[PDB]
């Protein structure tokens, strides 16, 4: 289930973080505009860039923290608040987040693995609701 998925992802966080992030950019290529240093770079070039792996892992580490603190896939309002208030997220809308979770769920469904993909979808929906309430447009 969802708790196991957090363990699966954490077990190999660098790989999963990079592969899910690339799945997101692949499905929604216009989203790459938010990451100015990754424009025009192949996947292998990206993986050779210190901050690509480091920062992408940090994104997913926080995601796993928020996921683990949730109850029945309902995130803490304080965690939603953190995400809204981050300077790096100042121009984002909840739609950016829903796209990430759509790509993440698609990735899970296509993987050779028994992720609780329905739960990740529901967590994404609940997170979008919480982001909206905390002030994200």
Eight-state DSSP code of residue 39:
T
Give 51 or 137: the residue with its C-beta nearer to ligand HEM: 51
Cβ burial of 131 (10 Å; 0-12, 13-18, 19+) is buried
CA distances to 70, 110, 114, 118 from 1, in Å:
14, 17, 8, 10
Residue 13 near ligand HEM by CB under 6 A: no
Name which of residues 53 to 72 contact ligand HEM (CB under 6 A): 55, 58-59, 62-63, 66
Q: Rule CB under 6 A: is residue 38 a binding residue for ligand HEM?
A: no
125 annotated as ligand-binding: no
- Phi and psi (nearest 5°) for 74? -100, 115
Q: Which is nearer to ligand HEM, 98 or 116 (CB)?
A: 98
Angle between helices 117-133 and 77-85 (to 10 degrees): 70
Report whether 85 belongs to an annotated binding site.
no
Does 88 belong to an annotated binding site?
A: yes
Binding residues for heme b: 36, 38, 51, 55, 58, 88-89, 97
List residues binding ligand HEM (CB under 6 A). Answer: 31, 34-35, 51, 55, 58-59, 62-63, 66, 83, 88-89, 92, 96-97, 100
């Amino acid at each position: 289930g969802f708790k196991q998925d957090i363990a699966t992802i954490r077990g190999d966080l660098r790989t999963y973080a990079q592969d899910i992030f690339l799945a997101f950019l692949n499905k929604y290529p216009d989203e790459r505009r938010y990451f100015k240093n990754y424009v025009g770079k192949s996947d292998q070039e990206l993986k050779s860039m210190a901050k690509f792996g480091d920062h992408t892992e940090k994104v997913f580490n926080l995601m796993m923290e928020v996921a683990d603190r949730a109850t029945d896939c309902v995130p803490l309002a304080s965690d939603a608040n953190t995400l809204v208030q981050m300077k790096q997220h100042s121009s984002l809308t909840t739609g950016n987040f829903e796209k990430l979770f759509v790509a993440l769920v698609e990735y899970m469904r296509a993987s050779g693995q028994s992720f609780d993909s329905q739960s990740w979808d529901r967590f994404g929906k609940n997170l979008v609701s919480a982001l909206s309430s905390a002030g994200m447009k």
